Amino acid sequence: PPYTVVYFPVRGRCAALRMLLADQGQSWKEEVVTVETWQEGSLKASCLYGQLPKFQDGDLTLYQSNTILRHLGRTLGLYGKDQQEAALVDMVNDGVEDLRCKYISLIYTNYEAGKDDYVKALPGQLKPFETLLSQNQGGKTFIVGDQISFADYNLLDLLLIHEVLAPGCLDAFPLLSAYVGRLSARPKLKAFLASPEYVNLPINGNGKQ
Amino acid sequence: PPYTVVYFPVRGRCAALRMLLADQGQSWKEEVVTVETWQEGSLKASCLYGQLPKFQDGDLTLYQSNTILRHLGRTLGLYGKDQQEAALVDMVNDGVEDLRCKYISLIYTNYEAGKDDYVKALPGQLKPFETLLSQNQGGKTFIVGDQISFADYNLLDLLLIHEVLAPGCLDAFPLLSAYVGRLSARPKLKAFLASPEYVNLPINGNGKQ
Ligand SMILES: N[C@@H](CCC(=O)N[C@@H](CSC(=S)NCCc1ccccc1)C(=O)NCC(=O)O)C(=O)O
Ligand SMILES: N[C@@H](CCC(=O)N[C@@H](CSC(=S)NCCc1ccccc1)C(=O)NCC(=O)O)C(=O)O
Ligand SMILES: N[C@@H](CCC(=O)N[C@@H](CS)C(=O)NCC(=O)O)C(=O)O
Ligand SMILES: [Ca+2]
Ligand SMILES: [Ca+2]
Ligand SMILES: [Ca+2]
Ligand SMILES: [Ca+2]
Ligand SMILES: [Ca+2]
Ligand SMILES: [Ca+2]
Ligand SMILES: [Ca+2]
Ligand SMILES: [Ca+2]
């Protein structure tokens, strides 16, 4: 396969770029890193920022999940039609990353005490994406413009894991709800989402979701 | 001016994009939002993600500091020479963002008790950028390729504020040390760094640095 994903045995920060690769009909190898292998120390010391994922595209080696998304966006043409749309795509993805950071903080450092405060705050955090949809062809296509972008895959992942965290959290947002149904139904993506290599991984690395 | 920056009266997440604009000979307007105006709520409610900075380039309104950097990178030609370099620029900026998030967490939530632990870990956090320099023309040009990129401006800001937090922290890193001196001496940037509109703002908004 032309691509390699090196990551822990979780969906985590690779879920979106995997969806992107599958949906775009690309093949890739998964190199799995166990917690035991990681704690040995050598792989970690060879990573630019001491962390995974690590990504190989031919002889190009990348770290940083959003760097990989943007690289795939750039090279597969999933980055809007012009500089104006590209800025909007970035704006969406940066918003997705901000909420992803908050989600990761809850999961790994404060799940038990923090969950209901997080869920009470969640509608306010999702609304900006509903508003973006409302402003683009009535929410009937994609988050930016009329072609899919890397930001769509990242947003879709974020929505999917929040429905697991808080089932029904999207019920107050008709555009986001139809959007999730619509993108998920894209044939290659639907098949990937139902496959063992997706379904049989946990969302996070600590048993929580 | 063709650009407007709407922000709190701090350097914060606007320092890099201001350095970029100044160094690239651009003019721009500063629209300042006081804590009192922000508390009133109406401006905040109008912001896409409820936060600043807000950036205007003509009738294009952007939110998210790194979206603004990437936008200016794209439109002003500070994004590498090809697709591979663009990926590397992204990789650097995402690394800078990660450390900035840690820096901000320290400053605003845990400065008193957490500073010693932060400073101890700091060499491990700066080494990646030294390594990147060592692999690009002996560290004698820019963080990626032969021309300046938006990532350089963000890295430069990150380095400057860490020298204030922990004076001498760059002493162990020859290439980053020389890099800071070299970019700081670029004529338009040198002038900006010495101007009241930079010098008379605090780095952060809580009195700590
Ligand atoms: N900005 C980076 C973040 C990479 C990252 O957080 N990687 C994690 C895995 S990805 C993820 S969703 N993990 C949850 C957050 C976490 C961070 C650090 C330790 C444990 C959990 C990792 O490698 N941890 C091991 C280590 O730091 O030694 C990116 O987007 O790729
Ligand atoms: N990902 C965004 C982050 C924007 C951001 O954090 N804006 C802060 C200002 S920028 C900064 S460096 N502030 C320090 C961190 C902070 C965050 C939230 C509240 C207070 C301080 C803000 O608007 N706070 C007001 C509010 O949320 O009501 C970006 O990069 O632009
Ligand atoms: N063309 C330059 C830089 C431009 C660039 O990086 N473009 C990316 C920025 S992440 C993009 O959004 N391209 C979308 C488009 O061409 O519409 C290169 O290949 O280095
Ligand atoms: Ca495979
Ligand atoms: Ca396309
Ligand atoms: Ca609680
Ligand atoms: Ca429903
Ligand atoms: Ca001005
Ligand atoms: Ca250039
Ligand atoms: Ca301490
Ligand atoms: Ca020195």
Author numbering:
A (entry chain B), B (entry chain A): 1 to 209
Sentences from the paper on this structure:
Glutathione S-transferases (GST) are involved in the metabolism of PEITC by catalyzing its conjugation with glutathione (GSH). As phase II detoxification enzymes, cytosolic GSTs exist and function as stable homo- or heterodimers. The dimer is required to maintain the functional conformations at the GSH-binding site and xenobiotic substrate-binding site in each subunit.
The structures show that the orientation of the phenethyl moiety of the conjugate was significantly different in the two GST enzymes. The binding pocket for the phenethyl moiety of GS-PEITC in hGSTP1 can accommodate more diverse and bigger ligands than that in hGSTA1. High-resolution MS showed that the modification of these cysteine side chains by PEITC resulted in multiple species of modified hGSTP1 proteins, including 1-, 2-, 3, and 4-Cys adducts. As expected, the hGSTP1:GS-PEITC structure did not show any modified cysteine side chain. Among the four cysteine pairs in the hGSTP1 dimer, only the Cys101 pair is located in the solvent channel at the subunit interface. Because the solvent channel becomes much narrower near the bottom, there is not enough room for the covalent modifications of both Cys101 side chains at the same time.
